[PDB]
Amino acid sequence: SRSCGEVRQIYGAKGFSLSDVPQAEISGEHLRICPQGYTCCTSEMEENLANRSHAELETALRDSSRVLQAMLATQLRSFDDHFQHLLNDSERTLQATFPGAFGELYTQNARAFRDLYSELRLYYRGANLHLEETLAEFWARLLERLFKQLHLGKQAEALRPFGEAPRELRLRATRAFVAARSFVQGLGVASDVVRKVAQVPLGPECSRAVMKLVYCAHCLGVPGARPCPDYCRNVLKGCLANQADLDAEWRNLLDSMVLITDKFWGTSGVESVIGSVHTWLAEAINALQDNRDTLTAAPRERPPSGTLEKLVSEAKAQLRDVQDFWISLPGTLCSEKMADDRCWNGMARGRYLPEVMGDGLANQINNPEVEVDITKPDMTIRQQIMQLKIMTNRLRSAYNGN
Ligand SMILES: *[C@@H]1O[C@H](CO)[C@@H](O)[C@H](O)[C@H]1NC(C)=O
Ligand SMILES: [Ca+2]
Ligand SMILES: [Ca+2]
């Protein structure tokens, strides 16, 4: 009713000077952002409120992004730590139980096994290695020394003195270790992408659009009004479009990542080789000492649910939950922090007629609330899309045994 007392309240409680707000409505000819009409807002008040709304949206965005980063980091640490512990507990179990069973056979060769575990370790960490060739070399030297303590051209390979254990170990390790490494690496790349995209600032366009969205209701004399859901969604879809462009490759990455988890195990019944290597080694040694005089001429059931299995289930739940993130941002921010027949449509309290825009940069060309340039995409987002592409390629090749 042309008394600005309510607006004076809100402006003052937001920590701005009460000096600048008039007692009655004045001509809004001076308004740059808000639709020109009789208003309680001074230009001062207008730019201040715009700045504030901008800051608020930024804070929201960074909050969401930080939540996502937190989740991804947690998953990363979890899987890395568990893989490494599995390898490690395998080695320590080997060191503990081997001298008893195999005696001097292991006792004299221990450096070979230690070195092998070191090789597997370096491989998981992403060093360049041919695991096939490494294992082959290992079996060659080990066979040499073992044959020497049992009592050049070697007939031995193709006479399979160690049995099927070397083959099993080769296949299983080759699959599982590249699976694990690729998965962890994928988590890392996801985290980095989110962290880098969070840094991309909002433009002046988005600023004026958000100001018109939020506090222009107050300026035009209807401060009790809160934005219509479709209005807010259009404004945010216009602001976040470049971020929305990440959707495709984000989804591809996450899909390939929930795909690669299946390769942590071979086909059914046997526990993952990643923690069970020592076991196949023992199998091989036993098979050799079984073949000792002809040459002179333990892989336990998989538990119904194991640690790695539970971690994988939880992780797949998380990834399935966050796959829609980039396009889910506007609805999420609008639902939680930004917003009953009559609501603020931006010219008055009423209905918002305009149809909601589609996702992505290109779809914002006709966006009524915000003016967006679709010709030049944000190239940071583009960089990150490239990263997603590359990591996805790595994971797809890893899934194919490549
Ligand atoms: C397991 O093995 C390596 C070798 O010392 C070590 O760096 C790592 O910290 C150990 N602990 C775990 C669970 O990573
Ligand atoms: Ca979701
Ligand atoms: Ca336009």
Numbering used by the authors: 29 to 179, 192 to 337, 365 to 406, 412 to 474
What does the paper behind this entry write?
Glypicans are heparan sulfate proteoglycans that are attached to the cell-membrane surface by glycosylphosphatidylinositol anchorage. Glypican-1 (Gpc-1) is the predominant heparan sulfate proteoglycan in the developing and adult human brain and is involved in regulation of neurogenesis, axon guidance and synaptogenesis. Recently, we determined the crystal structure of N-glycosylated human glypican-1 core protein at 2.55 Å resolution, which revealed a cylindrical all-α-helical fold (dimensions 120 × 30 × 30 Å) decorated with three major loops and containing the 14 cysteine residues that are conserved in all members of the glypican family. A study has been carried out to establish whether controlled dehydration could be used to improve the anisotropy of crystals of the core protein of the human proteoglycan glypican-1.
